[PDB]
């Protein structure tokens, strides 16, 4: 697990053979990560939309460990102010909001 | 309630006499709402920072009902793509992430 929200919900993740930190972001649809090198196929995706769009590489069905939980989901790879775990992956780990 | 994340976590809020919809956003520090006309004193606050800053009006200790929970917190009033309930108010309603 239960994470309170007095601080930013930053967790450790393992992806593409690297240990990283990422923000559990219920306001984000998708997961976006920077400085990762993933194997396999990708397609460009445009995200954002305020001020213009940002193009990223969309990798589908990426194995990723989020806070001890080995899951699979789409990871967008490109420049991001900070690494974001979006709802697409929070569903996979069985993460809910509770009050 | 327990809110799963397959959809955007949009909830009903009562604020300044009005009923509104807003997103439970754990990636947001602060709560930003548009088209509300709150009573009492305020100070300008600069938020965002990517591409420039956005100036909003910061109201402190605002009575607000979020999904049936009557709480008190800081509300920033200004133009926002989506009304956002940030961590500042999610702490007040006792909202946690769980997996």
């Amino acid at each position: 697990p239960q994470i309170t929200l007095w601080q930013r919900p930053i967790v450790t993740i393992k992806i593409g053979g690297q240990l990283k930190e990422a923000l559990l972001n219920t306001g984000a649809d998708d997961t976006v990560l920077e400085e990762v090198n993933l194997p396999g196929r990708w397609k460009p995706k445009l995200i954002g939309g305020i001020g213009g769009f940002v193009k990223v590489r969309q990798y589908d069905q990426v194995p990723i460990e989020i806070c001890g939980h080995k899951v699979i989901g789409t990871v967008l790879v490109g420049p991001t102010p900070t690494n974001v775990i979006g709802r697409n992956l929070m569903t996979q780990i069985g993460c809910t909001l509770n009050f | 309630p327990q809110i799963t994340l397959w959809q955007r976590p949009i909830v009903t809020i009562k604020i300044g006499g009005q009923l509104k919809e807003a997103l439970l956003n754990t990636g947001a520090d602060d709560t930003v709402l548009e088209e509300v006309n709150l009573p009492g004193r305020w100070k300008p606050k600069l938020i965002g920072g990517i591409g420039g800053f956005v100036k909003v009006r910061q109201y402190d200790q605002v009575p607000i009902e979020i999904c049936g929970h009557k709480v008190i917190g800081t509300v920033l009033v200004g133009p926002t793509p989506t009304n956002v309930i940030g961590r500042n108010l999610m702490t007040q309603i006792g909202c946690t992430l769980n997996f």
């Binding site: 984000a28 995200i47 939309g49 | 990636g27 520090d29 920072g49």
Partner: peptide, 7 residues
């Protein structure tokens, strides 16, 4: 700061 994302 504040962190959503559409799409």
């Amino acid at each position: 700061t504040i962190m959503m994302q559409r799409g």
